[PDB]
Structures are given as C-alpha cells and as structure tokens.
Design a protein around this ligand. Sequence first.
Ligand SMILES: *[C@@H]1O[C@H](CO)[C@@H](O[C@@H]2O[C@H](CO)[C@@H](O)[C@H](O)[C@H]2NC(C)=O)[C@H](O)[C@H]1NC(C)=O
Ligand SMILES: *[C@@H]1O[C@H](CO)[C@@H](O)[C@H](O)[C@H]1NC(C)=O
Ligand SMILES: *[C@@H]1O[C@H](CO)[C@@H](O)[C@H](O)[C@H]1NC(C)=O
Ligand SMILES: *[C@@H]1O[C@H](CO)[C@@H](O)[C@H](O)[C@H]1NC(C)=O
Ligand SMILES: *[C@@H]1O[C@H](CO)[C@@H](O)[C@H](O)[C@H]1NC(C)=O
Ligand SMILES: *[C@@H]1O[C@H](CO)[C@@H](O)[C@H](O)[C@H]1NC(C)=O
Ligand SMILES: *[C@@H]1O[C@H](CO)[C@@H](O)[C@H](O)[C@H]1NC(C)=O
Ligand SMILES: *[C@@H]1O[C@H](CO)[C@@H](O)[C@H](O)[C@H]1NC(C)=O
Ligand SMILES: *[C@@H]1O[C@H](CO)[C@@H](O)[C@H](O)[C@H]1NC(C)=O
Ligand SMILES: *[C@@H]1O[C@H](CO)[C@@H](O)[C@H](O)[C@H]1NC(C)=O
Ligand SMILES: *[C@@H]1O[C@H](CO)[C@@H](O)[C@H](O)[C@H]1NC(C)=O
Ligand SMILES: [Ca+2]
Ligand SMILES: [Ca+2]
Ligand SMILES: [Ca+2]
Ligand SMILES: [Ca+2]
Ligand SMILES: [Ca+2]
Ligand SMILES: [Ca+2]
Ligand SMILES: [Ca+2]
Ligand SMILES: [Zn+2]
Lengths: 136, 1115, 388
Amino acid sequence: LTCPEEEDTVKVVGIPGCQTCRYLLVRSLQTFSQAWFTCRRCYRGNLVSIHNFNINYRIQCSVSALNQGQVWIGGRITGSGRCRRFQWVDGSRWNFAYWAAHQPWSRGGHCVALCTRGGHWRRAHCLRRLPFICSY
Amino acid sequence: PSRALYFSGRGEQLRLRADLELPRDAFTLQVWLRAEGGQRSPAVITGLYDKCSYISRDRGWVVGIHTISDQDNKDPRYFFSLKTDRARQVTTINAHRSYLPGQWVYLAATYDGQFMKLYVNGAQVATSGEQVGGIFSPLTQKCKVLMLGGSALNHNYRGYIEHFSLWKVARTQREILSDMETHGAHTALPQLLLQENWDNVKHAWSPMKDGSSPKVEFSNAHGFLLDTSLEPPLCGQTLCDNTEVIASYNQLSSFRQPKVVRYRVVNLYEDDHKNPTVTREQVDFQHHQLAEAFKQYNISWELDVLEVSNSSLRRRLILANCDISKIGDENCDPECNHTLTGHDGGDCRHLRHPAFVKKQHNGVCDMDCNYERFNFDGGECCDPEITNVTQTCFDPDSPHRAYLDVNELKNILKLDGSTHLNIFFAKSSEEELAGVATWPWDKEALMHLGGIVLNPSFYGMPGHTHTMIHEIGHSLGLYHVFRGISEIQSCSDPCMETEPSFETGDLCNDTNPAPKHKSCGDPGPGNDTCGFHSFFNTPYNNFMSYADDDCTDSFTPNQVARMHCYLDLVYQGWQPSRKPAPVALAPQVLGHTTDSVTLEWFPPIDGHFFERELGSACHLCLEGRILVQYASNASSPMPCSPSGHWSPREAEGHPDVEQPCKSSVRTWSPNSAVNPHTVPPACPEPQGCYLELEFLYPLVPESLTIWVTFVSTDWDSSGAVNDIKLLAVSGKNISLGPQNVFCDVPLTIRLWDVGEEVYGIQIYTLDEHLEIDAAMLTSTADTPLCLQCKPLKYKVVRDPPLQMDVASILHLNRKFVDMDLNLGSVYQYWVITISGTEESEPSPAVTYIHGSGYCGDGIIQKDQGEQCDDMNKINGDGCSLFCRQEVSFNCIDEPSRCYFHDGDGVCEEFEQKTSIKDCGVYTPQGFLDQWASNASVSHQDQQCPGWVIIGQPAASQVCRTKVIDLSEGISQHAWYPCTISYPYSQLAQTTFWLRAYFSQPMVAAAVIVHLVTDGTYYGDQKQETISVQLLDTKDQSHDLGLHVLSCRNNPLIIPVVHDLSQPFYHSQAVRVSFSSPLVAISGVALRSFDNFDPVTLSSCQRGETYSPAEQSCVH
Amino acid sequence: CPELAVENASLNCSSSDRYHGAQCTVSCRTGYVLQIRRDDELIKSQTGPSVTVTCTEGKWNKQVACEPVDCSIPDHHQVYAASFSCPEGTTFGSQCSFQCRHPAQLKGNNSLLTCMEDGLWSFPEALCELMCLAPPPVPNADLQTARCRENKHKVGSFCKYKCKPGYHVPGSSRKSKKRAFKTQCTQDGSWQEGACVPVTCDPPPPKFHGLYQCTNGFQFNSECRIKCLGSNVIHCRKDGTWNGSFHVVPNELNSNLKLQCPDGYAIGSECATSCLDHNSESIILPMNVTVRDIPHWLNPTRVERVVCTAGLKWYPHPALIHCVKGCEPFMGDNYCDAINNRAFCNYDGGDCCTSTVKTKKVTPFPMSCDLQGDCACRDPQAQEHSRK
Ligand SMILES: *[C@@H]1O[C@H](CO)[C@@H](O[C@@H]2O[C@H](CO)[C@@H](O)[C@H](O)[C@H]2NC(C)=O)[C@H](O)[C@H]1NC(C)=O
Ligand SMILES: *[C@@H]1O[C@H](CO)[C@@H](O)[C@H](O)[C@H]1NC(C)=O
Ligand SMILES: *[C@@H]1O[C@H](CO)[C@@H](O)[C@H](O)[C@H]1NC(C)=O
Ligand SMILES: *[C@@H]1O[C@H](CO)[C@@H](O)[C@H](O)[C@H]1NC(C)=O
Ligand SMILES: *[C@@H]1O[C@H](CO)[C@@H](O)[C@H](O)[C@H]1NC(C)=O
Ligand SMILES: *[C@@H]1O[C@H](CO)[C@@H](O)[C@H](O)[C@H]1NC(C)=O
Ligand SMILES: *[C@@H]1O[C@H](CO)[C@@H](O)[C@H](O)[C@H]1NC(C)=O
Ligand SMILES: *[C@@H]1O[C@H](CO)[C@@H](O)[C@H](O)[C@H]1NC(C)=O
Ligand SMILES: *[C@@H]1O[C@H](CO)[C@@H](O)[C@H](O)[C@H]1NC(C)=O
Ligand SMILES: *[C@@H]1O[C@H](CO)[C@@H](O)[C@H](O)[C@H]1NC(C)=O
Ligand SMILES: *[C@@H]1O[C@H](CO)[C@@H](O)[C@H](O)[C@H]1NC(C)=O
Ligand SMILES: [Ca+2]
Ligand SMILES: [Ca+2]
Ligand SMILES: [Ca+2]
Ligand SMILES: [Ca+2]
Ligand SMILES: [Ca+2]
Ligand SMILES: [Ca+2]
Ligand SMILES: [Ca+2]
Ligand SMILES: [Zn+2]
C-alpha cells in the first residue's frame, strides 16, 4: 500500500513517566487491520498498548486537536464465551483499563478506540476509518 | 398515646372528606413527619389538587420531598410549591439542607396572600413573594381535593405522619413554635380548620378505591429533650473533632490522666526461628525512646513481641506503599524500586526499550530478559524447578512471587488488632517516610488489617527513632501540621487554614499553618502556597512535621488532647486499666421550677450505653435494647468464573466514603473484582447481579439501611436496586419490592411482620455501576442478645454537697431533678459514670445560679456569650444547644426565633459584606464600582459569546472548582475559551487575555474581578494565576501582579499600589491575562473614589481650588 | 432646586426650604409600577416604594415614572374556551369581557375580568362549560355504551367502538386480532379518531401477480378476479383465509443488477437477484418515489428472487427494480449515523435515540453532525417521539 505522508503525522514524546516510549500519531483515516499493517510496515511496530495513566493522558493531549472524536489504539476482543479476553495487538498483557461509562458490556464492535475528548476508551467497530497511533 | 400513620411507597394515599371546606385566601399546614431514606423523586406529603377535569394542571399547593437538580437526583430537600388560579407560573421554595432520613421533622407551610413561607422545625428556611392573591375562587371551590401522602399520578411518600393540622389563617412564626410545643388540641380556635390525631382515620379521610390504606402504629415522636448527636465539622471525622468535646479535653486535666496502651511488634522468623526481622536490641531501644517521648504526655506503652516462624514470609520482600498493579506499567514508580521487585519489573532500568519482544523460552532463566518488556523470560523464572521462586519470580500474575504487600501479610497473619497496636515491617525505596498508619476512624482500626507499617532497617536507628512516634501519633488521630497548606485538593478547599483554628487544617489551634519542608526553621518564599508568601511560628520542632529527627521533639497540648480523646473514644480495648469513659460534655440545664432544677447530660464519650463483657454482643446494644449491627461477611458471584463467590471486604464495616455521590474504592461494584483483561459482562436481565451481606448476630429485625453511594448518571430505568431478599435462618427468603434510592442520603427500609430471625440480605441490581458502601440492621426493642447486658449508672455530684440520701443514689436514665436549692446560691454539678463499681472521671462542671439564667430559659443574656436562647436544646433549628446561632441563620426575638437569611431575597445591614447572592457586591462608602462595557476577548466563538462580561456579574452563580468539563451551564454568565480545551493547552502553551473597557475613565483604586470557576483541572492538581493589568488613555500598561484564584476570594480584589510622587492616571481598559483555559470571568469592576476624582483636581491651575462636593475646579 | 412633580405618586420633603442639599421621598400608589431610569441607563425597578431624590447642580439626577401595572393580554389558559374583548386596555382598574364559544355554555351572573392591584386578572365569576356532543359515525363499526348515544357527556371519558370481524385498527398483529377500540372526548369538544380499515387476508402469491382486479385490493372481503375446472374467483373468510388460490433475457436491467438463475428461464422458476455494487440493495421503487429522495419513514420492499407469472413475465421486473445505496454495517454499534437513520436500515438499530442505544448516550461517527437534523432520532417507539 502507500505509507502516510509526514504532513498528516505528528510525534508524541516526552511522557512524565517513561523516557524511552515514543509514539507517532497518523491522522489519516484507516480501518483497524489497515492501521495495523501500516504501523507494522512503515514504522516497524504494532499499535500503541497503553499501560499507565501518563501514556493515556499524553495521548489524549496529543489527539484532542483532531476533528474526529475517536482514534485507534491496538486493543481487540479475542474471546468466545461468557467472558471474552481483551488483548493488545503487540502481545503485552492487559493490566490497565480506562473505559468510558457503560462501555465494555454494552456490545458494539470488536475493536478498541480512544475518545479524543476525555481520553476514556470505547468499544468500536473495526471497519471504522479513524486516526491511529503507532509505537516505534 | 400518640398515634401515627405509616405510608409505604406502594400507593397508599388518602383524600379529605368532601363535607369539609378547604381554605381559599390564606392557609397553614403543620405536619410532624418521619421520612424514610430512599424516596420517589417528586414525593408528595400533602397536596391540594383540582379534580374538575384536565384544565390548567399543577394549580394548587403541594408540599413534599424533591431533588433540587432534577437531571441528577442528588440533593433531596423538603419543598413547598404554590400556583394560584390566577398566576401564570408555579413557585417552588425549598429548605436549606438535605432532609434527614430518620428524624421527626415539623414541617410548616404558611401562605397569607403575599408571602409563602416554609418552616422546618420551627425555623424559617424559605420565603417567597412571587405569589399574590387568593388561591381559588368560591366558584371553583367544588372541585378541589386535599391529598395526604400521595398525588393523583401516584407521587407517593414513604414514612410516618403524626400530627396533621390545617389552618385557614397564616400563623406567625411564634404561633408555629407554640403549635410545635402543644401536641394536644387547638379546639378553642375557630380558624382551626382541621387537626388529626389518628384515633379515627376513616371518619375524615377516605382512601382511593384501587389503592390501599396506610398502616396505623404508635409514634413516640416527642421522645427526647436533649439532642445527644453532636456533629463533626467539615474537616473532621468523628465526635472527637467537635469543638466542645475537644475543648473539654483541652481545658480539664482530669481527662488527661495517665494511660497504658498495649502495642505489639510483629517480627518474622524463619522455620528454625533464627533470622529475625528486627533484633531484640533495637526493639528494646525503640521501647526506651518511645517511653521517653510519651512520658510527659501521660501515655505509657506496654511492649509485646510476637515471633512468627515462617520461612516463606521471611524470604519474601514486603512492600509498604507499592501497589502490585503498578509493576508492569511503563512509568517508573519510585516506591517499587527494589532488587527483589525487579527494578519495578524492569520499568525503571535505563536500558529498557519499549519494543515488547516476546522470546521463545529455552532452558534457564536470564536476568537481562526477566523484565516486563520480555514477558519475564516466558515464565521460566517463576518455575520452582528451574530456579528459586523467592529471588527470581518478579511476575505479579504468578501466585508464588518474590514480593508481597503489607495488606497480604496482614491477611496471612490475621492478628488480633482489637487489643494491641500491631506494628508491621515493610521496605520503602523512596525513604521519605514509613507505610500508611490506619486512622482511628478507619474501619480497619480495630481489625486485623490495621496498625502501623514501618521500615525495619531504620527501626531503632539512633538517627531514625522519631518515625515510630510520628506514625503512632498518626494512629491516634493527629494529622500532619502541613495539612492545611499542602495536603489540600485546591486553593478553594474549606480545610485550608488561613489562621489557626479548631476546624481548619489539622484541627489544632496551637499549630500555625506551615508547608512541608525538611528544614528546621521557617520557610522562605511562597511559590507553591496559594495566598501566603511567608510563615512564622511554624511548628518545625513538632513530631508531626517533616523535619529531621534532630529537630522534632515535642507535641503541642492540643495534640495531646486529641490523642487522649481518641484513646478514650475508639481505643478502649488497647488499655488494661478498666476505668470507664467519662461524660465529655457538661450537664445541661433543661428547666427549673420555683424550688427545683432539672439536668440532662450526654452519653459517655465511648458511645456505649452498657457495661463491657468480652464474650457477648453488648457493645452493639443502644440506649434501649436495640442491637444495631453492620455487615460481617459479604459475598458476590464472580462474573467470569461460575461458582467463584469472591468476598468483598468493602461494604462490610461502617460506611466510610468521603464524597457521597462519587465513585470510590471503599464500595462494592458488581464487576469491581474482575481483571482488566476479561470482559465484564452485563448483569442478568430478570434478577440482576446481587450482593449477599451476612450479619454476625442473627435476630428479628425492624430496620435495614443500605448506603448506596454511586448510581448511574443517565440511568433511564425506574429503579436502581432491583429487589432486596432477606435471608432467614429457617431457609425462607422474604422479598421486598424495588427500592428507589438516592445518591446522598442512605436507603432506609422499615420491615413489617418479619417474625423469623434474619441472618443476612441479598441486594439485587440491574445497574452495572451501582456502589454499595455498607449495610446496617436494627433489631426490635427487646433483643434477646441484649437482655444479659447491664446498663451503665450515673452518679451526680454537686459542689455544695447533696444530702447523704440523695448523693449516694445511682441513676439508670440521664435525667436528674433536685429540689434542695436556695433562692440565690451558686451550685456546680457534674456526673461520674459508674460501670460496675469502678467510677470514671468527672464531667465538666455546670455552674447554675438559682436566680439567674442559663442556656435553656429563652432569655438572651449577652454577658454569658449567648447569641441566641431558645427553650429546646435541639440542634435542628437555627440556635444550637450551646446558645450559639448556626451558620447562615439569624435569630431576632428575645425568645429566639431564627430564620435562614443567606438564601433570602431582602438585604440587611449585617449581610452586605458576605451575602453576595442577596445584596450586591460590597463597595465601601468612599468608593464606587463601575462595571465593564464592550469587553473584547482573545478566543471568540459561537458557543462562548464573549459579551457576557458586559454589565453586572451573576453573583448568584456558585463558584466551581476541580471541574473537568465546563460546557454544562456556565456559558450564560461568563466567558472562558471554548475553542481550546485543557489537554490541548497542556500540549501547546499559549496565553488567553480579556480586555474590558469602561464608559467613564476613572482612577483605579482597585480592580474587582468576579469568577465562577477556579481554573483548576480535575486531575492536574496545579494552582492557576491571573495577570491583571491596567491600560491608560495613552495606551500605557501598568502591571498589577500575578494573583492566585480561589472560590473563597470569589469577588477577587486587586488593589493598585500607586506612588504619590507619580501623577494620577486615568485608566480606560483592564487586561486580564491567564494561561489556563478553564478560567471563567463573569465581570470586571473598576473601583474609584466616590467623593472626588484626583486626576481632574490636579489639573486645576492656580486660583482654581479643588471642589469634591461638585467634583470640579472652583474659582 | 426646582419643584419635582411625579405622576401617580405622593411626594414628601423633610425640609420646607429648597436648596442644593435637600432630599425628597416619592412613593407611588398601589396599582402602579416604578421605572427608575437615568441618562442612557435602564436600571431595574425598586421592590419598595421608598425612593429619595436629591437635586444636583440645579438639575435632577434621574426621572421618576410610575406606569400602571400591566396584566398580560388575556391568555387562553386564563379562561378556557372563551374570547376576550377589552376596549379599556390592560392597565390597572381596566375591565375586560369574556364570552364563550358556541359549544361551551356561560353559567353565572357576571362575565367580567379586571386587572387588579396585584398584577393579575381577577377570578371569573362565570364559567364556560364545555359539553361534548354526539360523535361522528364510524363506518364498519358499532357503538357499545348507551350513554355515548346521548348528546351530553363529561370531558375526558371513553366510548367504545367495535369493528366488524375482519376489520381492525391497522397494525394489528396476526395472533392478537383485536377488533375494538375507544375514543375519548378531548378538551376542544371533539373526540379521538380511529377508523376500522380492512387489513385482513393476504395478497396472492407472486407467481400469479399482476392480472388481479379486486374490489378493494388486498383488503378484507375483497374479491380479486383475474380475467381469462375452477376459475380465479376467491373469497376471503372471517378468520383471515381464502377458499382457494390462483392458477394459470430481461435486458431492461438496473445499473448494478445481476440475475443468477439456478433453474434457467423456465416457467415458474425463481432466480436470485443481486446488486453487483457491494453497498447496494435491490428494491421495488414507487413511481412517485425517486432514487435520491426516498423518505425516512418509507420502507421499500426488498427483492429476493425473480419469479415468473402466468403471462410468462417476471413479476419483479428489473426495469422497476432499483439498486439503491444499501445499509452500512455500522448498525447497533452504539453509533448514530446519517446514512442508516431511516426505515430502510431499521433506524440504524436505534443508535440515534437515547432510550434505545445500549450506552444510553447518542454518539455521531462524525462529531460535526446535526444532532437535531441529519443525526436526529426518528423512531416512533422511543419516548422522545412519544407524547408520554
Ligand atoms: C498528666 O497527669 C497528671 C496527673 O497525674 C497531671 O498533673 C496535674 O496537673 C495539674 C495542672 O495541669 C495540677 O493542678 C494537678 O495537681 C496535677 N496532679 C497531679 C497528681 O500531679 C498532668 O497535668 C498531666 N499532664 C498532661 C500533659 O496532661
Ligand atoms: C506461613 O505462610 C504461608 C503463606 O506464605 C501460610 O500459608 C502458612 O499458613 C504460614 N504458616 C506455616 C506454619 O507455614
Ligand atoms: C532505582 O531506580 C533507579 C532509577 O530511578 C534505577 O536506576 C535503579 O536500578 C533502581 N534500583 C536500585 C536498587 O537503585
Ligand atoms: C537457591 O539457589 C541456590 C543457587 O541458585 C541453590 O544453591 C539453593 O539450593 C536454592 N535454594 C532452594 C531452597 O532451592
Ligand atoms: C488559639 O490560638 C490563638 C493564637 O493563635 C490564641 O490567641 C487563642 O487563645 C487560642 N485559643 C482559642 C480558644 O482561640
Ligand atoms: C517552592 O515550594 C516548594 C513546595 O513544593 C518547596 O519545596 C520549595 O523549597 C520552594 N522554593 C523555595 C525557593 O523556597
Ligand atoms: C463468608 O461466607 C462464605 C460463603 O457464604 C464462606 O465460605 C466463608 O467461610 C464466610 N466467612 C466468614 C468469616 O463467615
Ligand atoms: C429462596 O431462595 C432459594 C435459593 O436460595 C430458592 O430455591 C427458593 O425458591 C426461594 N424461595 C422463595 C420463596 O423465594
Ligand atoms: C429512667 O426512666 C424511668 C424514670 O421515669 C425509670 O424506669 C428508670 O429510672 C430509668 N429507666 C431506664 C429504662 O433506664
Ligand atoms: C464595541 O466596539 C466596537 C469597536 O468600535 C464596535 O464595533 C461595537 O459595536 C461595540 N459594541 C458595543 C456593544 O458597544
Ligand atoms: C399615571 O397613570 C396614568 C394612567 O393611565 C398613565 O397613563 C401614566 O403614564 C402614569 N404616569 C407615569 C409617569 O407613568
Ligand atoms: Ca511502574
Ligand atoms: Ca531463557
Ligand atoms: Ca492548625
Ligand atoms: Ca465500605
Ligand atoms: Ca440565658
Ligand atoms: Ca435550639
Ligand atoms: Ca437576606
Ligand atoms: Zn506522616
């Protein structure tokens, strides 16, 4: 496919927690699988797995300027039963969850998006065209 | 006797018989009612409705209980609403407070024709004059109906009605008080339209045909003369934080008698009992230092050393302030920075790269790949066969890991915290302090989860011996000295002590406000403090400050009073001396005849009305023989794992949430315990997720309260709690119906005809965000578990001594009448509590002069510090039982009748400076305030208009602080930047300014800026400043400094410091500059001299002298 | 200082001598409202009547005016079912007359209103009473209650009209064939509305569609005769069935339509219909309903198979079949969308209405959508559209 031009990509770095975590926010609208392939090809990494409130707050401060309300973070619902399991796409364990009001049990899509206003997450459909943040 | 009507919420409602004639011009409704906890949202106690047809509805008055905020359902108040047949609107007036959900309230609602007034407990709490004229004509008199306990749309009410009375004339407030006292008959008055002692309900009232009828019980509504419930302040927690109790502990030195307190040191040994946590030498040295420091303050410590032989616990690190969930996250926590931790799972190591690469596991554990970013080497390092578990397994998911938390150690050991002060040991990498000591008012303070966590490597070190004294003072009710400066949420917190006070800060008058510093002197500049630059007489030598151990050496006497009062209040089990708790308050004088006096005194400071037995349930029994108990064993099903049944340790003890309508960790959620990776399911549709709360002593109940803390904001179903099933010991479940609940007040349920014993309840919910904080069960009036208990006796001593018959007597009740007084003598009374044969310390003496007055006579006597004097000794009205008027109340007459004046409409001379809602902004006599016109801003928008600063500001708007989203309702009164949010301003730094112009260019003595928002973000915890500047007519700028905002400086005043050598300058515009986009400016005022204008008077040439009378040059 | 005369007021001065430094208190009478103003300064009126004025520099600092207190122009809710003639005005002391409508009856002596001192019109001493007359007749329905036949009734009660067996309110389910309803006398003197339309029985099977010429179409007790052993004469029964059934390359395609035949062009074969566009569906369009302007309350009949008729023609003619913009798959994902807010896509699964979205809060996929317009709730089952 085509790598996104750098005029539509911003860099988010300088978290008050870690000092090695760097993220790249692409404002181009893409689906979940296309965002996964775009991050894995053009920037050599999966989508962002959020593990703490500092990363999520810096991500919210970066994405609050966008016109779109939702961005992509790499969380999926990989399960079948009475209780499915969330999974990050980079394979890291899911220890931090920052959901909105009535979010995980209210059905929806099988992908995880981040609301740009408030920073709270939201279950969203995977065919939605949204901006996406890659770790690299 | 007195008789009462119980209305449940099932639709039981009455109407008046049609032979009676309803009032038209004026009326007065007086009703004694005992409301229950959870109510319907527009609950109606008594209403008058039109039954002609559907024409011009909500005409006629309705009194009831309803929430102020209809879209939130948070604050339920008593209300009275009237709409006459001629008015074009319905006026609703509300009380000044949320309703008390368990007390008898004397509601009165009067209307004469120009003024509708609402009195709660005889104090006028609401008044309005927006309804004028009669209610209805005699032509439409035929189709008006008086409903009791409900409405036509079934707006039903839960609780008791005792003394209904309806009058055809508007009674005055003194007549309201007289009818409150007289519970009998007013039959001599022709204007008494109706009064109802419920001997015959069916004579004058008729029920609805499809509906049922209310139950008829006995009331005992006027059952006490002295209100024995004393409330803590806004910054306090228990009865000891009250001003009068701590004043009697500070003054009388018989309350500070020496005590012996047992404390227990818990050092872990290995299986062969060889390697300790602390040595015996440091245990003895710490005991010597502790007995040295507390010997002056009359507290002795008895040392118990408990050895625990466990090699599994000894080899595992204990983490004081490190949460287990904070190990794998990418930020570097300084608390979890240890070798056995794994350097915070490898998230504090410098060579960590964020690329999570999971390696295939092959053989032995590697230390370079035992971090979080390498999946802890695929679980090889946590295998017991490959390597030792207790030095390699850093994975928090594994059950056998290298570290442990102190609460897990407390659950493992499970000690008896009810009789000793347990000392636990854990490491601390940040080494600022030790672990969190449990406060006396915590629910764990007498459980196994409570005690003091210390660092064992600094225990008994010659330079670190004062940390245990600091934590011991923390466990005895003392805050840090710097609570009112640095331990506050924002600059607008009510507990930020600007002055030494008994109610602000650390509740100690002898500790001046101070910040936190490590130095042994007063601090320098004030870069972090809001309104203070320098501090003087700072308690740097206090034990409670953060000074070095060569600096801290003393306790202030107020701290010693707090420690002794908390030892008497909650820590009676830690002392081997069985001297009972004294009556902390002086005896109160209730009445006198010509030759006798009557005294009533408070219960003792322990709160227990019975003697102490170890193997019984006599510590729960109340003033009668009602066993009030809380939960002991909660059980809820785990949603992901069937038949899991996890036990929530929250929702067990007494309710302990600070914010009553906020999500908290101290409650139970239906899916609180699920892991973040597993999807939390919705609750089952037909019944819902349920909590099973078991009580320790099964009995026959009569009442059940549940402290529901958080409900969903947009719930949109009818009820939150789905049903409550009482679990009986016979196997039967008794299912109560769906319950309406409120966020603030608890949910109180009265139980009818539960013959069998009840050992627990089940609370079912269809809400996935419901939070339950506690549950309390109250038994019947003679519990069989309180029959063996023996009550405390009271012995009254008089300073002119009583006769030998009178003086030796022992009182079961708390009332004492004596008739051996002379007509002018001065007596002093006190009361000693006798439990068995051992007496307590005496209460503070009450001095009674038989000719003069006291605090219950109805005569205001200014020499004895009486602001008001009623005759009630009840704290519900505007005047307290200590002759002190309460906050935002005013009492006028010589028998003091008090009214609520802060939320009034009229302005009086004593409230011009403070009541910004009623009066205007207080400008002094020598000055005048000109507000802005045509204010130009920096960020114009459609949503934020930017012309709202023009004119006088909205003084009735409540100042908001710590607010995340400002887009609710404040855009109609003030300007804030709509375009920029707080995260975007955090990203890109910018400056927002507001330029305001004035019609008349005056000389600015001061600039008054009115705000409705503090400017602080909900999660930033950073104070915000503004930079006001003055702009002259020649476009020069004069800096007025950087000013810190607060909601306690809501008309913010910026004075102009002008040197008299410089000429006075006309100021046209004012530029308010700030950085945070959450600051809302309702108005900017320019304050000038009212008498004269010095710029014009200085321009006057020779021969033209000044004239401030006409403000011109005169010649 | 000059003499200050205030209309409709009593003026007092504590000093007889007038000089610069003397003040006079003016109090306006009952039934008059103060208007304290200044030069380019409209201030709010004083609640009290005591206002003291002081002369400054030979002039007066303000002006004291006291208008008559104005009652509102007589409301419809002040007196119901009446008209108001007030030639005297709406000032204090004015009088107005009210007269009822023709169904309403004026009962009482005096029929006058007066704008009084407190600012409101007085109590009406006579009443306009509304009496509901006899209802208009309903075809194929029968009255039940005998008091509803009378011309006198109260306002707000119900009268039952029962339809014939087979006739019912439209929208009646097949299992619950309720054949009666009620009408209530409303506040305007009329009744509620309801007509028993025939919706019972079924249209003929699609293999013989087109040649039918019924009396009332597909309605109850309508006889359809296909014009040409039995014939094409069938009669619907009371329970909802008939006495029998009927007997005996499309190059005009759409821009995306494809017809796959598993049975070929034989007689009676049913072939699958699809749209080659991925986001398109084949519907039957009415002639007055264009492609771009389908209303949001319209549900077009979706096409599944083409079936042959008795005239050897395809009943779903592909010329009449339009491949229109199909439903995007973001239905039921707690997401209000502009495309699927119509009856063609189940109102986006109810995501645009607050009572029906599972998160109980409406979220638009583009945050810059019209919340009351393009992304608005349009569901009649919701409580926003419902009057309750
Ligand atoms: C500790 O307790 C002793 C009593 O054992 C207190 O000593 C009394 O002090 C008061 C003045 O404060 C004297 O009037 C009494 O005569 C003293 N009694 C005795 C027996 O010495 C002492 O004040 C207490 N100290 C504190 C800090 O509370
Ligand atoms: C030692 O501690 C373990 C927990 O690690 C606990 O299960 C056990 O009961 C304790 N005592 C002994 C004697 O093992
Ligand atoms: C403590 O944290 C620092 C960084 O803050 C880290 O370099 C070090 O490895 C950690 N552990 C120890 C034992 O110092
Ligand atoms: C701990 O590890 C050392 C070397 O890795 C080994 O010699 C020792 O036996 C281990 N201890 C236990 C209890 O397995
Ligand atoms: C409190 O402290 C002040 C000094 O800050 C002192 O003047 C006063 O007497 C103390 N006590 C009370 C009850 O105010
Ligand atoms: C500024 O305030 C902080 C409080 O957080 C304090 O630690 C620091 O010493 C202060 N700076 C100066 C120069 O006093
Ligand atoms: C609490 O209840 C659960 C299940 O009813 C039971 O397993 C547990 O032992 C109980 N605990 C106590 C202390 O009663
Ligand atoms: C009571 O609960 C038990 C299960 O705990 C159930 O089997 C039984 O049917 C219930 N009985 C009633 C009357 O609700
Ligand atoms: C207090 O009340 C009465 C006195 O009228 C008497 O029963 C006894 O003195 C006391 N009763 C109890 C229950 O303590
Ligand atoms: C404010 O000043 C500008 C600049 O002359 C003018 O255009 C505007 O009309 C003024 N608005 C008001 C309300 O005076
Ligand atoms: C005094 O009353 C008359 C009565 O119509 C009114 O026209 C006039 O305006 C009133 N005076 C003032 C100053 O408003
Ligand atoms: Ca960490
Ligand atoms: Ca390995
Ligand atoms: Ca203090
Ligand atoms: Ca709790
Ligand atoms: Ca007195
Ligand atoms: Ca009182
Ligand atoms: Ca007032
Ligand atoms: Zn501390």
